[PDB]
């Protein structure tokens, strides 16, 4: 079966709340990609319609710094798959309420996997009908590749440290 | 003129059931959330100065955690540069019934110093044992790595900022 | 001075935690009543782009019972607008992660008041364009009519309370 | 039997946390909601025992702002009852803390449906005592129509979304 | 500049949420001790109407487990004071909600010290009223030695221990 | 059979966080409990290799307060034992992260009970290997005795109230 990427697409705005405000009073980067796994996963059931677990997060660089006036929206769909694995695309934007004026914070693959009976389950594939979905799409494989050989240089991280 | 463990953190914790899943299991989130907070104590005991996550590396969640394990934080500054940092971050996970051990993950977390407003001076670190010394080579090679990651980064802020279509 | 309502819409796609759970393993109603005044606020601060204050929320009816495996879309939009009030229309719908059958669980009328140096302070009008947004402006004057009696209700009781 | 409605009385009293202040530094509406529904709940589960669920809350007008300087008491009661429902009052008093200065910050009735087997259950009635118990339990059968009538709009509504009926 | 202890009595009934519990289906001793805090904070605001802070908590002993359906009562009044010292009792009380039977979870004498601008600041006296208060007023000199005591212990053990 | 003590250590170092604050801009007594159970809830599990329960926990004297700039390690380990019960010691140091200037900002021993089908259950001798570890292991029998007093005094204060 067959899904357009608009179909598992979820957004979240939100203010900023200032227990998770820091030295300076700006936002902490880890409430950020912890909102940015939460709003991915939220995607990547929309999709696959089952029940799904965080296997990845691609590198992520914080542009802008957040502050208390701020909002904050967490755009997110699913823009490639393979057979169990759905790479999720997110967007973080920062609005400034009073000011009114936007910019974008964060932009993040991350990488979630759709699990049945604690085995990994089969995921329709995605379809873009979107200039950005489309280049997003193109570019998919690469990155899905670059990630395989990644995850096994985590992997050997956790052995050379083991001993 | 510094050393790795002068900045060394270790926080332990307990799993908690709000940070559970469909399938009872720790979410991604809270892990990353508690990589960011760790690592920003180690960057500030070494800095000695307040500073902000500039950007994460790419973390793989080579385990689930569930809800009878313990989770340990292990984190230190292992590179620098004049206000950046490169935190190294070690996730142990510990089922607490049986004594089996795993390494859930791994980060480096680059943090950036900042005196007033804009980035300020921060020790060089110096390695002291063995393993301190073999996450010192790849240094300077990731800090170049990730110097391309940024503007790849930022670059796809303006095609979406400013909308430059896709190719550029 | 003018606003079109859509220039004020805010949406919050979120996951049910089990904290927020009581002993059917049902959303309680004060965590529902509690999203909606904080997605109502961002919706209130987009239009006023001024510092909002919650003045009232009107009844809620939770006419379907929420589950771990729903999420909740909660849509916010000023409908209405005073000198310096405004109120917010939100729309609750909850769907079955994985079944995917979608239902609204509450609707909420409630009412922001933009606030500057401490006293109110003036807002925009907001003018509609849609079937439901006309229908919501027009039976809107009603609507705040019937509170300014209910606030004197309240105001009253309070005072009866002391005694 | 029927209970007394002091039998199912419940006082949370509590401080104000930074995280639920406003821009303003004022705490907002939603906390208060969420904790009239907490007390609520806790009256409404000793009156009846069983369980219970919040079928529906009656408007709530903020009267005052409260500041991180103070504390707010909510006090909650059943005082209505119907078959299955019950009808909970919730006042909210605010108090300065190094003034001693108290106000009524809110009142709320907050219905409250037992279920004993996914199906709601047989509430026992509940006579009042005191004065106060008069006041609000003789008025207590005209605001149980006015939501027989609150609730019809909202179902209505419900299905002008759903269904898509064109409004009116 | 004497106040009545029910001038300062504050009660808390919340429901036990899934979070604090531990692994048992049980409640977190430390989220107990959590709102024992908390609740003694708020009866020495309202007694000294001064900013307060926590000097010492006397030992609490956990007489009953508390279960995921049950209600947590706490109640908090000052029952002896000094120049700028407030001791708080707090009793905690566990309600199942299905059954009605309850039973004393906890009791605990916990200590504030009213400060104004960075020293303690003065604070009035309490005045018992019922059997129960006069018993904790009587007794209350006795247990102020025993911490002035348990108290050079604890700065001893900082000392020794760096 | 047996395990030595640093079998046991766990280690939290955390931010203070802007909630746990008071007016004073200071940490919450309440918060520092919470946090020292939750330590030694890992410390006792490490230990038992079962599900534990917090049963009491000694007087704490709170001897620093800690700013918002401060970081807080707690720092614990099971230090003496009987049957089913477990004593484990916590050590608070408060570090002002922007001068790093240490401080011991309290001690605590707290009582853990191993649990096994609702009833109490067999649990390892604790070995200690250093002065520390040597000096509160002897200490540990006169602290069990004492606690054993309060204990029956709590219970007293029970029955005797509503
Ligand atoms: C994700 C996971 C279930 C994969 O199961 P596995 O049997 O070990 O791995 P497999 O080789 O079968 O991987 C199956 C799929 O996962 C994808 N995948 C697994 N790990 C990945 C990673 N680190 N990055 C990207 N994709 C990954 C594979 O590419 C593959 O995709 P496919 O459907 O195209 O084949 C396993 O890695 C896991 O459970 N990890 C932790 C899960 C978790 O709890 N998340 C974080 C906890 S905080
Ligand atoms: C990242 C940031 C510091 C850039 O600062 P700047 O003044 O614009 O740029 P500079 O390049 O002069 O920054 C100085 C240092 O930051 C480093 N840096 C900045 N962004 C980086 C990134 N994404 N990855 C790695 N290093 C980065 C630079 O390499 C440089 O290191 P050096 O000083 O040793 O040479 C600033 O944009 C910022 O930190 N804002 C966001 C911070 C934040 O709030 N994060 C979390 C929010 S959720
Ligand atoms: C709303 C508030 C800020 C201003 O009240 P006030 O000083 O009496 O102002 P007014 O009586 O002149 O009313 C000003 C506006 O408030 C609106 N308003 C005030 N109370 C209202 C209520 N209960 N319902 C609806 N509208 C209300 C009025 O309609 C008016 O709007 P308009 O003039 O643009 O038509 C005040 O009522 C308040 O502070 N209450 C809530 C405070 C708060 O923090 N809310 C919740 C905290 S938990
Ligand atoms: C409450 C609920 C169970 C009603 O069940 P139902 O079979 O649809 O309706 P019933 O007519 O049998 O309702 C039974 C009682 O609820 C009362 N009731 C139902 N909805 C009500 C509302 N919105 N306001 C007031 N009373 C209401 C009825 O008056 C009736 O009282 P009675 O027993 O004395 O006659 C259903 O509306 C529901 O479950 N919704 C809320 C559940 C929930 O989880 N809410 C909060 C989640 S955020
Ligand atoms: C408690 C504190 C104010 C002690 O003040 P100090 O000037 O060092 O000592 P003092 O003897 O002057 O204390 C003043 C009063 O408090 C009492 N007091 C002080 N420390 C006490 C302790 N640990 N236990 C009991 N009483 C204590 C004194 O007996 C005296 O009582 P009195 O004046 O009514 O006779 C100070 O040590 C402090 O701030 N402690 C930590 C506060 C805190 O942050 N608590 C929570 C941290 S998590
Ligand atoms: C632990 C508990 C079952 C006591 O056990 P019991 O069935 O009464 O039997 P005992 O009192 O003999 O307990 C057995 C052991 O615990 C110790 N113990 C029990 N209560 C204790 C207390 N209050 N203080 C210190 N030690 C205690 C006994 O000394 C004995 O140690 P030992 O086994 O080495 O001899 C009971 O105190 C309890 O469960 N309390 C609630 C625990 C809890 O939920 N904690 C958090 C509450 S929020």
């Not at 991350?110 to 604690?118: L, M, N, S, Y």
Request: with cysteine.
């Amino acid at each position: 079966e067959k899904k357009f990427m608009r179909e598992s697409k979820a957004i979240k705005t939100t203010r900023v709340f200032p227990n998770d405000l820091n030295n300076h009073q700006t936002l902490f980067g880890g409430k950020l990609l912890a909102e940015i796994d939460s709003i991915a996963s939220i995607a990547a059931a929309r999709h696959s319609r089952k029940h799904c677990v965080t296997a990845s997060i691609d590198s992520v660089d914080f542009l802008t710094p957040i502050h208390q006036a701020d909002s904050v929206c967490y755009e997110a769909f699913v823009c490639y798959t393979g057979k169990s694995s759905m790479e999720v695309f997110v967007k973080v934007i920062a609005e400034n309420l009073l000011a009114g004026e936007r910019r974008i914070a964060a932009t993040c693959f991350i990488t979630f996997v759709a699990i049945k009976d604690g085995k990994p389950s089969s995921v329709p594939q995605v379809l873009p009908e979107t200039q950005e979905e489309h280049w997003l799409h193109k570019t998919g494989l690469e990155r899905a590749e670059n990630r395989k050989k990644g995850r096994l240089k985590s992997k050997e991280m956790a052995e050379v440290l083991t001993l």
